[PDB]
Design a protein around this motif. Sequence first.
Motif, mmCIF file in Angstrom:
data_model
loop_
_atom_site.group_PDB
_atom_site.id
_atom_site.type_symbol
_atom_site.label_atom_id
_atom_site.label_comp_id
_atom_site.label_asym_id
_atom_site.label_seq_id
_atom_site.Cartn_x
_atom_site.Cartn_y
_atom_site.Cartn_z
ATOM 1 N N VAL A 38 2.136 1.475 -3.820
ATOM 2 C CA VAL A 38 1.063 1.919 -4.703
ATOM 3 C C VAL A 38 0.626 3.331 -4.325
ATOM 4 O O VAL A 38 0.102 4.081 -5.162
ATOM 5 C CB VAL A 38 -0.083 0.887 -4.657
ATOM 6 C CG1 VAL A 38 -1.310 1.281 -5.477
ATOM 7 C CG2 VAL A 38 0.439 -0.401 -5.186
ATOM 8 N N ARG A 39 0.939 3.745 -3.090
ATOM 9 C CA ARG A 39 0.380 4.927 -2.417
ATOM 10 C C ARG A 39 -1.141 4.858 -2.325
ATOM 11 O O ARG A 39 -1.850 5.816 -2.637
ATOM 12 C CB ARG A 39 0.834 6.239 -3.053
ATOM 13 C CG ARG A 39 2.230 6.591 -2.724
ATOM 14 C CD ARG A 39 2.695 7.729 -3.558
ATOM 15 N NE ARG A 39 4.049 8.070 -3.184
ATOM 16 C CZ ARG A 39 4.840 8.829 -3.919
ATOM 17 N NH1 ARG A 39 4.398 9.299 -5.079
ATOM 18 N NH2 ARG A 39 6.069 9.107 -3.504
ATOM 19 N N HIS A 40 -1.638 3.710 -1.869
ATOM 20 C CA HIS A 40 -3.003 3.637 -1.374
ATOM 21 C C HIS A 40 -3.154 4.395 -0.066
ATOM 22 O O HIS A 40 -2.178 4.717 0.610
ATOM 23 C CB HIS A 40 -3.455 2.193 -1.165
ATOM 24 C CG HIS A 40 -4.150 1.593 -2.346
ATOM 25 N ND1 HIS A 40 -4.500 0.262 -2.405
ATOM 26 C CD2 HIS A 40 -4.613 2.153 -3.487
ATOM 27 C CE1 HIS A 40 -5.118 0.023 -3.546
ATOM 28 N NE2 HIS A 40 -5.190 1.151 -4.225
ATOM 29 N N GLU A 41 -4.408 4.644 0.298
ATOM 30 C CA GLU A 41 -4.750 5.484 1.435
ATOM 31 C C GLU A 41 -5.442 4.719 2.553
ATOM 32 O O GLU A 41 -5.514 5.219 3.675
ATOM 33 C CB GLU A 41 -5.663 6.613 0.962
ATOM 34 C CG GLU A 41 -5.027 7.521 -0.070
ATOM 35 C CD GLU A 41 -6.020 8.483 -0.678
ATOM 36 O OE1 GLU A 41 -7.226 8.344 -0.388
ATOM 37 O OE2 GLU A 41 -5.601 9.367 -1.454
ATOM 38 N N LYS A 42 -5.982 3.534 2.263
ATOM 39 C CA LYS A 42 -6.738 2.735 3.222
ATOM 40 C C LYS A 42 -6.267 1.294 3.095
ATOM 41 O O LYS A 42 -5.838 0.876 2.016
ATOM 42 C CB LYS A 42 -8.233 2.793 2.937
ATOM 43 C CG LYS A 42 -8.851 4.152 2.841
ATOM 44 C CD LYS A 42 -10.308 3.985 2.517
ATOM 45 C CE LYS A 42 -10.471 3.342 1.148
ATOM 46 N NZ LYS A 42 -9.989 4.216 0.061
ATOM 47 N N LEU A 43 -6.387 0.524 4.167
ATOM 48 C CA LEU A 43 -6.170 -0.916 4.130
ATOM 49 C C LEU A 43 -7.155 -1.630 5.036
ATOM 50 O O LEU A 43 -7.296 -1.265 6.205
ATOM 51 C CB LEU A 43 -4.765 -1.273 4.589
ATOM 52 C CG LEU A 43 -3.615 -0.988 3.659
ATOM 53 C CD1 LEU A 43 -2.363 -1.334 4.380
ATOM 54 C CD2 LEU A 43 -3.816 -1.878 2.458
ATOM 55 N N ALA A 73 0.817 -1.204 0.000
ATOM 56 C CA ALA A 73 0.000 0.000 0.000
ATOM 57 C C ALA A 73 0.853 1.258 0.000
ATOM 58 O O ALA A 73 0.412 2.304 -0.476
ATOM 59 C CB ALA A 73 -0.926 -0.002 1.200
#
Lengths: 131, 136
Positions: free
Chosen positions: A19-24, A16
Amino acid sequence: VMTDPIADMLTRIRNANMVRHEKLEIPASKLKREIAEILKREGFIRDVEFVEDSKQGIIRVFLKYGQNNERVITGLKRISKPGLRVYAKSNEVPRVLNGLGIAIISTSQGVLTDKEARAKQAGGEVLAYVW
Amino acid sequence: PTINQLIRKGRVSKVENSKSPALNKGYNSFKKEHTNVSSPQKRGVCTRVGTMTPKKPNSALRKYARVRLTNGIEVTAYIPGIGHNLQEHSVVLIRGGRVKDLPGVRYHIVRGALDTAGVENRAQGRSKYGTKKPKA
RNA sequence: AAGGAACUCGGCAAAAUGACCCCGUAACUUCGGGAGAAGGGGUGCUCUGUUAGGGUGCAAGCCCGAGAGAGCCGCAGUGAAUAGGCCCAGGCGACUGUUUAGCAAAAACACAGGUCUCUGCGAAGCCGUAAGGCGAAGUAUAGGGGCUGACGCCUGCCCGGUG
RNA sequence: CGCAUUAGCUAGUUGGUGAGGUAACGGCUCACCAAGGCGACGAUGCGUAGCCGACCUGAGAGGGUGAUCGGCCACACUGGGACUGAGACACGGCCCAGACUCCUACGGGAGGCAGCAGUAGGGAAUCUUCCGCAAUGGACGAAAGUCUGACGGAGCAACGCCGCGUGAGUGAUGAAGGUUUUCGGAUCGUAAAGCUCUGUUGUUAGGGAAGAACAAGUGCCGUUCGAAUAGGGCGGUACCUUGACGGUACCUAACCAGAAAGCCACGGCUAACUACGUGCCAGCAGCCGCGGUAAUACGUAGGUGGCAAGCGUUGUCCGGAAUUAUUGGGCGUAAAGGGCUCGCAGGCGGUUUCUUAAGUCUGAUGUGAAAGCCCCCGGCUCAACCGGGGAGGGUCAUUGGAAACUGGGGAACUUGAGUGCAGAAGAGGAGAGUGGAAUUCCACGUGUAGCGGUGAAAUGCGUAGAGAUGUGGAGGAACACCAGUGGCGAAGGCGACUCUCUGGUCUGUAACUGACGCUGAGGAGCGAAAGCGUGGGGAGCGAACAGGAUUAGAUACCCUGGUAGUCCACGCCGUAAACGAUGAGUGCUAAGUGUUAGGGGGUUUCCGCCCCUUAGUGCUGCAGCUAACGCAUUAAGCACUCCGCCUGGGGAGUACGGUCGCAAGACUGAAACUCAAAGGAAUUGACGGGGGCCCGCACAAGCGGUGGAGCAUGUGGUUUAAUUCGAAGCAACGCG
RNA sequence: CCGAAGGUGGGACAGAUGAUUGGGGUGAAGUCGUAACAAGGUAGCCGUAUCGGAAGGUGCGGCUGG
């Protein structure tokens, strides 16, 4: 199968990051709750929230990209893998990037961080490097 | 591999072979066996002193003496300097030195040894090739 | 006596082993064997004992008698008799068998096996002029004839000549 | 601690009862019974080895060593035995047997340096046949004393470490001389000589320590014994004694730079360069590699550089080497994923909670001797070294706390896994039956001269009537169209149809179970094709073999024939570029897009469009990875679990051994020796009997010639005294 | 009684050596072909069988590393 869920949550946070996601969403065992609570209180995370449910529960993580594009968490690592467990004495507790990172180390009085276990002078499992 | 695989098969360390094995043995006379002595130098008697040639592009005739030792092994050694004393049945002390040019030759005859006289007309590289500090 | 195959065509003949029990046993092998391989040990009598153990008997008493200890004699204890000599390699034939009664027992026949060919059944082949049979009260997994010989790996080329 | 190319090893071995024996427990020894014992966690066997504190290397983890010093062990010419003694089965004791040396009067005796010196031998190779018991130990003695090759010293060896040296300050005529030079000089260079000066060391001559405390002998004093102030013990003094080293270290005075420097290298790594000789010779070399007439690489001189009473070479360790990778590597193509499955042992284990305390952490206690490494101080003129003080090092034992995690035990959960129900699809398998083309062969009609085949032909087939053509029959094998980066299977693999039996998958869940799961060495199985055995079968094809062509040859490609085999039943083999050259499981990590089998939704009863979700299957693609090609949600990304495998190329998947096999072979699997590469991916070229495009008297279309003859001319050979030299395919040859 | 040595015997392991032999490596411009690399002039390779002076050919199956 799944063979240890702690390493899997650490790679889920690492992927994450990249990818630079914001939520997990992570299926939230109790040691995962304490890991994400430590990483919350050390500022690696914006905030962490729990979803208590019937199946196994969900823990949601909100990854912190504080400035322009700056991964506050650069990398994660699991030290004690299930197949080579790692245990450190209190005069062997590792300080990582000498001070600038940290190690989640679950000693005999609570799942501690690096500095906490060093100042409480007990040792145990050494179960994550967090940079 | 995995840690259990490292526990039950281990890391097998790579084989070491000595570069000069005829020094790496020895002999006792009545026990009739072939001891491991690991010795720096061996004297032996010359069985054939000739000269012969290298193989490819490098082409200049080498020196080539064949010596049977005190452990019992005949090896072709080399006589380094310019112009040598040796005959057949000559006492020769042998050090380990590979001669790349001539194939099959992996020792030097120590010059200045028991019977291998120091070389003639030499002033630079005195200790190698055996010669005394001449006079001044 | 001593020697021991120096005899000799050739250990021919003779000598030697030769029983029972225990130990132990190779190459090779078709896994069975080889093998009783080889090479060793013990074998009497007496007392412990009508024993330990069995068979019969309802019990008595009769047979059968491993093992041990003690001991005794002899040069010698299966004390006589008569009951493998053994090992190593090679040729041929796999073998058990058969054969020139009366000179040759074989490496020769035969053999299981393999293969070729014939033959549709009143078979083919055989005996007899023929009837009549054999094949066979059998039917191609059957029946004659030639050849080769267990088993293992294989069995090359030639159809010009003669069939 | 090495080998599994050592897998089975034991029988007093494994237990029992009883006895003996022992300082003691015990098959330690014996009787009698029982069938035990060790075993892939490596028994046994073979090879190697004294073990450790420590030592060397290394950042460390480790790897190697087991000298000195110190602890334990074992040995005493080899094997066995006992004796005595508290303690030996005894290095300088005994008895026996064997070998060796010696003596013998031939009957019989003696001996054991692996104690300190030394001798001979082996070897590349390691020392004095010394002084002393002064000091520290030992033995005995009441003591003096004696013994002590332990020990103190002394001698030899640069064998190692350490410390001081061979001079110093000043000095330009940059002297002589060397080497080099474009001859202006540069350099050896303030380095010599000049001046001044020290004496560590050299030597001569004086003085001379600590190491010595004592023991014993006296006298006291206190005290215990005593029948007692005898007398003796014990303690404190108070004296007299004692040195092998040795007139040694040491101190002091005198004299002279006088006695005292070498070794290796100079192309790069690697600090340091020129000249002369050599001429792929002599030679150098660790590697790259030098040297074939201009050698900073060879030999010499000068110079420089490195170190320095050392220096260089060798032999072995360790590092470098992340090159066995735990720290700290890998497997699509460089070496490397087992052909694939089913699974035993092993390893690993989703969630909540209680409890336990084996792992883990922590405390206390003991201990890990002395020396050594390390820290801190001290003494040797400093240093080496010595000394003091401390630290360190255990998965160590006992003991006490913690309970997060791993594990244990109990209780709960449903996601993982599986059962239930409902459909769906499939060349999934095995057995039997059947079909339609076509091919061959057979019989008969038609009918006539060819057919077949080739780059070209020929062999074959054919007037005994072929090929073509029509009908019928026999027989075998494969299943056109469907057909598709379509489906199924673990992989091999599976295509006509139909039935019989049968395996797996996918989808929708919610009914149940409640962690039942993953992986898996060894084992067991499947396993294309060829091959093997037995029995059938044989249409096409087709190894082998034959004929014909081609060709220099043609054991080939081509053509014509044709055996085994291909086919079937069962058994064996157990191998493939068995491939995705990509192990299995699971989770996470943008999209776009076809498609296969499903499900659900938003209008429509539909057709159908869109949306949504699975599981499989293609392509392009972001992040990420990679050496690059490329992979990329079907990973070659990011991780965790487990397995298999790799550690340069060859030799070599060889040889030997073992197992399996009828055999062919399979599996396991080296070594001597040999090389400095082998290799991957990509780039620039060149080439192709690769593709495209184009051009030129290059080809064709023509015209004239040359090659033949005669002569002119030039060249090769050959004749020569010389036949001067140069050119040598195009690009020499009426050329200079 | 035990018992070292010695004696006899049959096996097991290990080193030499052995007429002869089989594959391997390396070597002075040797002989025969040209199998592979290009469509290498018959695409190559893998397994297996077979044949052939020799590289090799041929069959069957598989692979693209055409």
